[PDB]
Symmetry: C3
Subunit: 267 residues, 3 copies
Amino acid sequence: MITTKTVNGVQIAFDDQGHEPGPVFVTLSGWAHDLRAYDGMLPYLRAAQRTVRVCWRGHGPDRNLVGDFGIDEMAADTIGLLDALEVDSFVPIAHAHGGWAALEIADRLGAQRVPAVMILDLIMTPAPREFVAALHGIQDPERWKEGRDGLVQSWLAGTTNQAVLDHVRYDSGGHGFDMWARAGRVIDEAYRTWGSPMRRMEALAEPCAIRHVFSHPKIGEYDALHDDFAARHPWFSYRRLGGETHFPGIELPQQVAAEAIDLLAGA
Amino acid sequence: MITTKTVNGVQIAFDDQGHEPGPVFVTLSGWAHDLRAYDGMLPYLRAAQRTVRVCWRGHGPDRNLVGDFGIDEMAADTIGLLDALEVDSFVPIAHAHGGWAALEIADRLGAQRVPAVMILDLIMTPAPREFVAALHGIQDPERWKEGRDGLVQSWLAGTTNQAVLDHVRYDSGGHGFDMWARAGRVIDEAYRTWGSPMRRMEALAEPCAIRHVFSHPKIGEYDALHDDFAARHPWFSYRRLGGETHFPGIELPQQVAAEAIDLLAGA
Amino acid sequence: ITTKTVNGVQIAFDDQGHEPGPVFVTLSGWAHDLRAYDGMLPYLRAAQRTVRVCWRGHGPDRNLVGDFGIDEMAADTIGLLDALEVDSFVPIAHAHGGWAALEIADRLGAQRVPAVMILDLIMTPAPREFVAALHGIQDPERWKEGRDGLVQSWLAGTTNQAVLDHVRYDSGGHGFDMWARAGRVIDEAYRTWGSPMRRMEALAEPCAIRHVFSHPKIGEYDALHDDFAARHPWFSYRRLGGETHFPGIELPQQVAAEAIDLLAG
Ligand SMILES: CCCCCCCC(=O)Nc1ccccc1C(=O)O
């Protein structure tokens, strides 16, 4: 099933399924997990379009520690893989902070090559100070596991969804302080540089169609910030989903797949 | 599940299952797919004999581009693998144009080491002009994908066999122009060099038992050609199957495995 | 299946679970990999974090590795678990993987390795048919006969499906190099120590050790275990009602429970 290519001199794991014409779905996971984040959505995505599920460097089957990297590399690697696989136009689907690389990829290639982007459960406000507090705790060699269990318990929010539970408990092993510390750095730095992902989006040369789908962030006035953003910018849309967890693509695979297909159709 | 060894400086993916006295079944796929082309046959083959499924160079999990190669490397890599495992006598089961490499193996090693060869749906006549056109089309950098989609339509006809449809749609990703173009050159050169696989078989120093099992060229003069070849060559046998597709090992795995097992019994 | 380089060699593993306490660490026999524990894994990973470990040369990459024995098998596994930030752990080890589990326990002490579970390791000196296969599998000119003898001694005319499938279909991909090394290393352990029971008696600081088996289904064999357990309160044993030499595959629920009980103490 799982194939690899060397891109930018590092090993990128992926799989490539489907032959329908049109834009390719490219799945991009969050930090510390791999293309199994999209097992639930995959049957629906691959029926609709060629779907390429992409792993970050250091996240494939080879779990040796890699040279330090962040969002520039995640985007350079994913783009290099797609050129090698002769993927022309494509629609990134990106989980939480993988959204940052998805937007970097959209900015580098333009709206004809990347006509749309879906983001799942990415904090659109500036970084809350509780979050920044945990981003530092996972950079602590003696307490990073503490920070991880803390982030996870709030991601689960006491769900009973077996897909989400199994994925967190069982399907994201083999990472440790190196990768969790790096996630801390890269995320912490992304919010310090841009302020928030919405400000990153407004800095896009020619914004493609962007859709944020989420269930957690809040309740909430988080929503009015989206309405507000969506009213300012025709290319932005969004959809609160009513899941219990930070993992809408796993908790609600058909609905999220439906959203991606709709997003693609529109563009 | 899948293992790799370095043979002739390249990575050869394979898997090895079964423990039974006698010859070993060695599965060989066509161009641009891997050992999952024998997932359906494998239960029946491994119950009968030790079975080694072999990928070509560049077709394993590592999908980095490799240097140019043809039938000679395919044959030498496979032999090198089996020598590394100390497999003694074995029976290649080869899909379509993997059959050229199976005959070259049989020729190199002779009929005690390779007492029999099974080939699955390999055009035994000279290449039809419409096939030659397709082989040239997959060498065109701008239209290779059209050439492929045309071939696939041929191969599926109107099937609703899910094993075959899933194999072609979903289980054969991760290849592009480098490999499809190479298949075109190599298959084209083979028909121009030998005229046809049947002429190739007649050039064998000491022919082993060779069986051709096929569904596709429609019934008619193709079967008469096979009747004539089998009347001239007692070491040759053939079976037309009732399938719709170019993939008898995937569409009719039980029946093709029984044919292999019967071939081996008789040699 | 994931890999890491440890001590210059590729160690394949997988890592599942997050419950606190000691980590389960599975160790397969010669010529097998993690699949030896597919059946117990659902039970183990629900109870504790579980790391299934392959020996060097036994993972997906089947290129030949530097010659090695128990010492390297122990050090590669320790090195992996350190890279995975595993602290205390309870090895579960099939047959002659048990020698490496005992070495790991010896090296690390009874706090980091509070218990070891071994699945069907002949606790007497080896029987003559087995010893003859250990020797034949080392002989360049007859090793395949040695391997067939070894495989026949594993199977013992059983009819259980999971175990037939495991032995027949999950031990491929090895050649003379690794099959001869198994014979060499197993025979060397019996030559060095006499028996696994003598090896355990040599432990600096015996942890709890439980032997789980269905075969050697005699009377003299349970006597041996009774005598040894009378002499040694850290030793326990459970004879299950299976027919095969692979309790973790034949009776995965019952083995996993014995492991979970073992860990509890
Ligand atoms: C992406 C789905 C592809 C499935 C690959 C199966 C390969 C195969 O069966 N045949 C050929 C491949 C290249 C050129 C000619 C042929 C021919 O069989 O005539």
